[PDB]
Amino acid sequence: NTPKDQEIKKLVDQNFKPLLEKYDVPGMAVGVIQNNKKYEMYYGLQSVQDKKAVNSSTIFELGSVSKLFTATAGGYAKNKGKISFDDTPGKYWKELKNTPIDQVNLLQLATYTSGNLALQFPDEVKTDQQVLTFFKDWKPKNSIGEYRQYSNPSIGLFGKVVALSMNKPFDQVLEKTIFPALGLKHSYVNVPKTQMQNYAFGYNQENQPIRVNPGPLDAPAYGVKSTLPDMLSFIHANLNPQKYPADIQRAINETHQGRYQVNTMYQALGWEEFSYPATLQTLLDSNSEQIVMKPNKVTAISKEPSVKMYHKTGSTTGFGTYVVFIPKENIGLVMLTNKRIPNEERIKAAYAVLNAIKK
Ligand SMILES: *[B@@]1([O])OC2=C(C([O])=O)[C]=[C][C]=C2[C][C]1[N]C(=O)[C][C]1[C][C][C]([N][C][C][N])[C][C]1
């Protein structure tokens, strides 16, 4: 006896709204798409000092959810014949030819199995020449392809090679090719001056206003900004890839293909993948310190899950993101905040909402 849009708003109020007070978060956007119908819920302020309300135009930093766009770009290049995932980086970045890193193939870079690449570049690697020197100085540790360690330099180098194969800077690969193909008109690597008024402040742990700073290969690792409507469209594209031209369709499907497992988690291209229904602990394990911060030996996929779900967390110093979608339920959810909150809370809140929505 209650309209569906009110039912979903109530669920988001019950499970996401309390996080605002609990973590002193200034602003939040939550969206649900179910059976091609979109539901948008905005809370709080995109700028505290300006008393500017979060709304459909608010631009948030996606953090590592940006890696999903990097993976789509690589899937696009691969299916256009510009790269093979068996290639090594020196085929495209010629100065890496005959260096040790040129023994690692593009899939291994994209899925974090070089065997010796940490979460971040060293603090002092900043310039283009310093990034090149860092990879020229790279030497193997663990056997290549056997150990997963979540790594910005790893997928950053993949993104750089994808851009080289397409004869464009990476920011242009997204803003001129991939965002238009996905129908995203309010998504940016670099937010233009004409849109800065819509760029939220992020807020650090002292609730001080901040925004992301430049860093090495930032764009492919964590450098996309977007709005809730654009992120719901992105979820829509992942739920309905057969509604895009052949090259973009195949690119999206590329990001859904599991490549190896670490226990219950399947590493796809950018996306993390799970058998569905997934237990809460399966989803929480994917965010454990053991999985996120340490190397873990990988194993071949044994059960290729017919029914599955995908998710990805992302953070910058001042923003939190979570995206999740379940193809066979034709449903997905996006959470954007301009303050970080624990990944476990994002996963729990989305799990409660998605399981409670009437089918
Ligand atoms: B990305 O968001 O993935 C990620 C997660 C996750 O998946 O939620 C958790 C913890 C770290 C990471 C790394 C990715 N995000 C960043 O790289 C953050 C970025 C790093 C450079 C800046 N350096 C300032 C250090 N105070 C901070 C923002």
Q: 337: alpha, beta or left, given left = phi > 0 and alpha = psi -120 to 50?
A: beta
What CATH number is associated with residue 143?
A: 1.20.58
Q: Which long-range contacts (CB under 8 A, 24 or more apart) does 259-263 make?
A: 259/107, 259/111, 259/301, 260/111, 260/113, 260/148, 260/298, 260/299, 260/300, 260/301, 261/298, 261/299, 261/300, 261/301, 261/302, 262/148, 262/291, 262/296, 262/297, 262/298, 262/299
Closest CA to 264 of 287, 247, 235, 241: 287
- DSSP bridge partners of 273: 266, 310
303 CA from centroid of ligand 1 (Å)? 31
Closest CA to 171 of 221, 232, 244: 221
User: Rounded to whole angstroms, how far apart are CA atoms 123 and 143?
Assistant: 26
| Number of domains making up the chain | 2
Give how far Cα 350 sits from Cα of 7, 43, 131, 169, 333, Å: 15, 16, 37, 35, 7
Widest CA span in the chain? 68
- Spatial neighbors of 300 by CB under 8 A, at least 6 apart, are 260, 261
Closest CA to 20 of 50, 42, 51, 52: 42
* Per-residue exposure over 15-29, b if at least 16 CB sit within 10 Å of its own CB, e if not: bbbebbeebebbbbb
Q: What is the 3-state secondary structure (H, E, C) of 146-179?
A: CEECCCHHHHHHHHHHHHHHCCCCHHHHHHHHHH
Give the nearest ligand 1 atom to 212 CA: 28
Structure token digits, residue 297: 């030996």
Q: DSSP alpha helices (H): ranges in the chain?
A: 4-15, 17-23, 66-79, 106-110, 128-136, 152-165, 170-172, 179-181, 218-222, 228-239, 246-256, 280-285, 289-293, 343-356
Ligand 1 interacting residues, C-beta cut-off 6 A: 63-64, 152, 212, 215, 221-222, 313-317, 343
Structure token digits, residue 323: 């995206």
3 CA from centroid of ligand 1 (Å)? 39
What CATH number is associated with residue 303?
A: 3.40.710.10
State how far Cα 154 lies from the chain centre: 14
Q: Are residues 21 and 130 in the same domain?
A: no
Q: Are residues 339 and 198 in the same domain?
A: yes
Q: Are residues 204 and 302 in the same domain?
A: yes
User: Rounded to whole angstroms, how far apart are CA atoms 88 and 97?
Assistant: 9
Structure token digits, residue 214: 């430049």
- Domain range for 82 is 73-165
200 CA from centroid of ligand 1 (Å)? 18
Q: Are residues 211 and 244 in the same domain?
A: yes
User: Rounded to whole angstroms, how far apart are CA atoms 127 and 263?
Assistant: 38
Is it true that the peptide bond before 277 is cis, omega within 30 degrees of 0? Answer: yes
SS3 40: strand
Experimental method: X-ray
User: Rounded to whole angstroms, how far apart are CA atoms 45 and 52?
Assistant: 5
Amino acid code (one letter) for 9? K
User: Rounded to whole angstroms, how far apart are CA atoms 185 and 175?
Assistant: 9
Q: Are residues 58 and 84 in the same domain?
A: no
Enzyme catalytic residues? 64, 150
Give how far Cα 20 sits from Cα of 57, 168, 242, 320, Å: 20, 41, 37, 12
In a domain, 275, yes or no: yes
Q: Are residues 241 and 308 in the same domain?
A: yes
- Torsion of the alpha carbons at 224, 218, 321 and 281, rounded to the nearest 10: 140
Are 185 and 229 a contacting pair, CB within 8 Å? no
User: Rounded to whole angstroms, how far apart are CA atoms 330 and 262?
Assistant: 26
Closest CA to 155 of 70, 83, 88, 77: 70
Q: Are residues 197 and 329 in the same domain?
A: yes
